[PDB]
Structures are given as C-alpha cells and as structure tokens.
Symmetry: D3
Subunit: 150 residues, 6 copies
C-alpha cells in the first residue's frame, strides 16, 4: 500500500544549521508526500517518551536534553516503502560512516549532532506519528504525482 507513513524530525541542530528546506526538498524529489509538518519545541515529557527505548543508556540524558534545547521540525511523509527509504536516505547512526549523498553523510559529523531522526519501522513510525501528531494535523486525501506509481 502507498499509505505507508514514517516520522521524521530535524532536530535542533539541522534546524539552527539551516537545513530544513534542503532536507524536506530531498524527500519531495524522491516522490513522497508531506502529510503533516510543524515547528515546536519538544517537551522533556515528549522527549523521554519519544526516546523510550534508550531509557537506561548513558546518553539518554545527553539526548532528551538536546532534543528539547530548541525547536524541532516534525513531519510525516507517505508513500511506498517510505519507512525504509527514508532511513536509507538519512544514513547510519554515525555521520562519519554515512555514505556521501545521504543526509548524515553530507552534513553530519558528530553522533550527538546527527541532524535528523527517522522511524526505524512501521511500528515505531506509528508510535511516533500518533504521539507527535493529533490525527487532525494529518492529511487524508492523498495522491502524489501519478508518474510515481503504476
């Protein structure tokens, strides 16, 4: 189904660095639709839940602190395989090991400031969407360029 959605959030570093458009631009070009988008400064409460699975790791502290140290451009893209393609496009956890051509590969250098977050799977995509987005903020009627899909 071409309804697969994912959740992306350009953190306070891709934001203060002037990358919001560049990043969105890359997904628009691939062929994915933007079904939600907004700017907000994440709450500790939202930071801790967003980052639930890292509750016990040394860096969870360093994480939530930063992800709410400024604005975050949260968004949702839809399309076939969107969840895995986005990751692929994002790169790997460490910017320095990210191949050139991927968001992290091209602009990233330090794991702590690795620019963007993208759902690792449909399940977390959905936990992430619902969580940041109230169903009203999303689109419903969606048909990207009929030259994308057969």
């Amino acid at each position: 189904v071409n309804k697969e959605r994912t959740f992306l959030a350009v953190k306070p570093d891709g934001v203060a660095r002037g990358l919001v458009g560049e990043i969105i631009a890359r997904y628009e070009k691939k062929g994915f639709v933007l079904v939600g988008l907004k700017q907000l400064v994440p709450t500790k409460d939202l930071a801790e839940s967003h980052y639930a699975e890292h509750k016990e790791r040394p860096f969870f502290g360093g994480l939530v602190s930063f992800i709410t140290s400024g604005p975050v451009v949260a968004m949702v893209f839809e399309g076939k395989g969107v969840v895995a393609s986005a990751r692929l496009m994002i790169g790997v956890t460490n910017p320095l090991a990210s191949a050139p051509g991927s968001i992290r590969g091209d602009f990233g250098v330090d794991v702590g400031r690795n620019i963007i977050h993208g759902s690792d799977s449909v399940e977390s995509a959905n936990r992430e969407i619902a969580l940041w987005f109230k169903p009203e903020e999303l689109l419903t009627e969606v048909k990207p360029n009929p030259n994308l899909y057969e």
Copy 2:
C-alpha cells in the same frame, strides 16, 4: 530591531509541485529564522478572510477556491526587513514578468498558479500571521547565526 516578521504560505500548486523544500531553503540561506510552520487545508472562512482586500475583484472568485483545494504550508520568518526582502525574492505577481533568481521568476508561469504568498507590509504580516497562527505556535527565544548581524 531584528525581530520583524512576515507570514509566507506555499499554495496548493507549490506544495503539489514539490517546492516546499526549495522555497524554505531560500529564506533559510538568506539568513532569516523560521519562527512558525505548519501544513493544512485552509477553510473558506480563513481564506476569504485572507483575501479580504480582493472581495469584489473578478478573481477573488477562483482565488478562494484554490487555496482550499489542497494543502498549504504556512510560515513566519524573522530578521531585518524580512517583509520587504521576502517579496523581492518572490518576484512580481505575473510569474512571467518575474526576474530569474526570484521564486515566481524561476518556477511560475501563470497568475492563478503563482505558487507563493507574501506579506506586503509589516501591518499586513502581523495581520495574516494572527489569522493563520495561534500565539503558542511561534518561537520566542530566537538566536539567528551569530555571524549574521553586527
């Protein structure tokens, strides 16, 4: 004093031609700070309230009928003379008459499908901002690049 704001909004034809990234990136490279942002489908009420000044104009008709036929990305940016600088970057009403390097100049071709809206005067920015944006959807502690202003 470096806090001037304008409300821009990419219309259904910009948002659907996959130009939200490009457009945002342009003001972003210029140096203005994004202070609000959100996708949505405008309502006849807010749209007709937007085009108040064009009520009896023969085009107000299909004007309101287009900024509600799909998604709109609203936004507010901030910095020195952003209001005047934005329009300049947008171009002129007729995209065919806009200079290359401007937004309508580079991607527009018809007056109905002229891609983006801008605030023509502070008074008007402040007026369209409050329309589209609630007071708690816009940043406050701002800090543009420290290399940007003297």
Copy 3:
C-alpha cells in the same frame, strides 16, 4: 494560448562546456514543455539562413563559422509567453551585462561565446522552428502539469 512555442539552440560553446542539462533543466523547472530536441552539427547553409538578418554585419562571418564549428542542441519549448520568458531567462546580448540568475549572466563572458540562442519573437520563433524542425519531430499532444495553468 498555451501553445506559444519558441526556438532555443545551445551553441557549440554551451555544449562543449557541459551546459546542456543545466540549461534544459531551467526551462523544465519554470513550467515549459519540451516539444522537440536533437543534436546536429548545423550546416553553413542553415547557419546563414538562421542568421539571415545579420548578413551584412562585420560579425556574420565570425558567427556562422562558429555556429557550425561543432554540434548544437536545438530545441523547442511550449507554454504561455514562452517566447519572451525564455529571452528574459537567457539574459542580454553581452554576457557581462546579463544579470546574475540568467543563463548568460551566470555562465557567459564573451559576446562571441554567449552560449544559447532564443527566438526574439513569435514570428522568428516560427521561422526558426519550421527551419530546423520538420513537423514530424515535434509533439502535438501536450498538457504540462495542471498546476502550472489555471
């Protein structure tokens, strides 16, 4: 009418300099359709007729010589106001006086190597199309993105 066509030809200098895609790219983005396109090395006979109105000027010699000293990517774009918009996008005769953002302004430096040629009016557009293009080489069925025109 959205059938206005124009004739553009990237001369042997925009060609050997690696500009064909860049140049085409700019017209595709503005919103114009490509109704014909081909590579060929112009004939003296075609050069002299193409450049008919400069038959008596000192440079006509220097012109036709060069315009057939190599391959030329001849093309035809269609859309509203295509003839005048293209010129505007091309710049002025002298690259050095061409505003930045226009093809000549950005890549041009010497009038003799000013990169591209674009019809100055419908009348020469048509004399130029017919002349380089046999009606069979052009398209007929044409509808660009319905987000360009109202």
Copy 4:
C-alpha cells in the same frame, strides 16, 4: 579506447516529471560526451523490439504500454567505461533500493515508474543504439575536455 558508448533514454515518467535536464547534467558533469540526442514517441514495434529479452515476463505487458504513452528522450554518451558507469549512476532496478546519489535512488519510488533506461553491456548498447539511432544522427569528430583523459 575512450570511444565506448551507451544508449540511455529518459522514459515518459522522467520526461514528464521534468528531469531531462538533471539527468543529462549528471552524465555531463561526470565527463562523458553527448554523441546523439532526440525526443520522440516510441512505437510498439521499436519498444517491443527494445524489450525483446522480456517477451514472456509478466511485466513486458505494461512495459511496452508505457514507453509509448508519451515522450522519450533517447541519447548516446561516450567515454571510458561509460556503459558500466552509467548503470552505477542510475542505481538498481528497484528505486527504493537504489542508493542516494544515484538517479533511481534520488527520484524513483516504484519499479514501473523507474524513470530511466541504460545499456547493461557494450553489446547491448551497440544493439539499442542502432535500434533508436540512424547512423547519421550521431557525432564522429569528438573531443572531450582536454583535461579529462591522460
């Protein structure tokens, strides 16, 4: 010896998504010389003759039915291992699986609408070139950038 050629062709979905410039520019920046080029609407004959190797495959069906539903930009480039290098730049069959930086990787999302075709082996280039191109539509006196080869 530096004369290898491949026949690439931007399909109805690339040509219609306004990607002929971008695609051409990529091989152009790489260093290959364009040695032929032409837009056109392929015929069932030449198309089915193109996809000969896929005759009984369940997709040959709507395969031939798409490369004839609109315009196609055929082209031939030339240089060292262009044949192998082209494919690499194109990506892999599934656009979702193509790496960012490649053509299908950056703009594709479905296998039916995968944008561009390429020659997978010299023997196959030479085979598709002669199909689409008459012997008098391709350059002969070629001279790539003098800084390009040793």
Copy 5:
C-alpha cells in the same frame, strides 16, 4: 582585455558561514580564472590601508575591527571585464537591497556583515591585489578556455 583582474575577498562572516566554496564556484562558473587564492587573518595594518578611503568616513571603526576579527579568503580572478562583472554578481552594499541571484541577495541581510568585498574599479583592483598578494603567489600563466572568449 581577457586579462583584466579583480581582487575579491570573502569576509569573516562569509568564511564562518560556509560560503567560500559557493562564492568561488559562482565565479568559476561564469568563466573567470583563479589567479590568486589564500587564507590569512588580516593584520590591522592591511585592513587600514585596504579600507583607507573611508577614514574620515565614520564606520571605519567597524570595517577594520570586524575584518581583522577572523580568517579571510583572499582571491584574485582574471577575465574580460572581471572587475565590473564580479561587483555585479556581488549585488549592492545593502544585502536587503541586493536582488536574488547575487551573493549578497541570496545570502546576506545586514549591511555590517555583507559577506564579501570586491574591487570597485580597475584602479582599486591593482592597488588591492598588490597590497594583499605578492607577485610570486599570483599565476603568470593563464590558459583562458577557448569556449569562453572568441
């Protein structure tokens, strides 16, 4: 002559914003040749000599303090009419007044930190070029592209 030269300098606010490459590439694109290039930190001496003409002018204070406040990438480009062309590409004194397409229009918003200085006349160029560069650093051998000048 195709051997005119201008002295350009990406100011500290330019070097700090990651603009060196972009700025340099705009020029390499137009067709000018890099004859001189180097990063240094201007000594108060050089800044006073270089910005001499504005001594009695009030703002001399900032121009020099600011300009010595960090690294500078000094450049000397050669080319037919480079002096007047380069300043055109730069835009006007106020980045808010500069039009899109020019270095200051695309990137700057405040007069105090307007990214780049460029020689205003062939008078100031040779003056500034000698004051910031030494005969041995500047190339004597220039091979102007044949597809550039006639």
Copy 6:
C-alpha cells in the same frame, strides 16, 4: 578529537575544470573547518617528496609530471575524523569505481586525472600538511560550530 586535520589538494585537472568551489563546498557543508588554503604550482621537488611512497612504483613518472603541470589548490581541513571522512567523500582510486555522491564518482572517469588527492592516514596528513604548508599559513584559532560537535 575535533581537531584532527587532513591535507586535501585539488589537482590540476580539478582546478582546470572549475571544481575548486564545489569541492571546497562539499567539505564546508559536512562541518569541517578550513584551516589552510592556497594556490601554487608544485615544484618538482614537492611533487617527488609528496608522492615519494610510489618511487619504485612504475607510474611515479606521470603523478609528478602531471601534478607539476599547472596550478594546485592546497587545502587543510580540521575536524573529528576528517582524515577518514574526507577520503570517503573522495571515492576510490578509479573514478569509474567511485560511487555517485563522492567527488570522483560525480566528476571523474579516468584514473590518471582523478581530480583530488587526500591524505590516507593521520600519519600522512601531518607529514603532507607540513611539507605543503608553513606553520604561519595554518590557523591556530578554531571555533568549531556548536551545532556540529557535542
């Protein structure tokens, strides 16, 4: 440490093709800081010392002759893991083998003229950096962007 340094050099074939700005901007984009920069023409001495390791290696002949055959833009970038990251961005020895996204994959097609050299290890970097640069040319003051490193 965020103070590792690599020595990069755009070879003659790179300077001649108008690639300095692009190459430099790829690095400024990633997040590395330019610490050293200058254009010179390598003396046969420097080229032999610099390319020493390949003496017994056959192709020593070309590497040095070619590398002295024109201007060079010498660079020294600083950054966490710059050495290994920079070589990754460059691609592999053969530009035909390099993947899109890297300097050599996007731009080169022949091993002999592969545009840029980059230090292979922190061992070779400090060696090469001292041999091509002088303590006074290299910045001592570095202010690494806060949105870059944690």
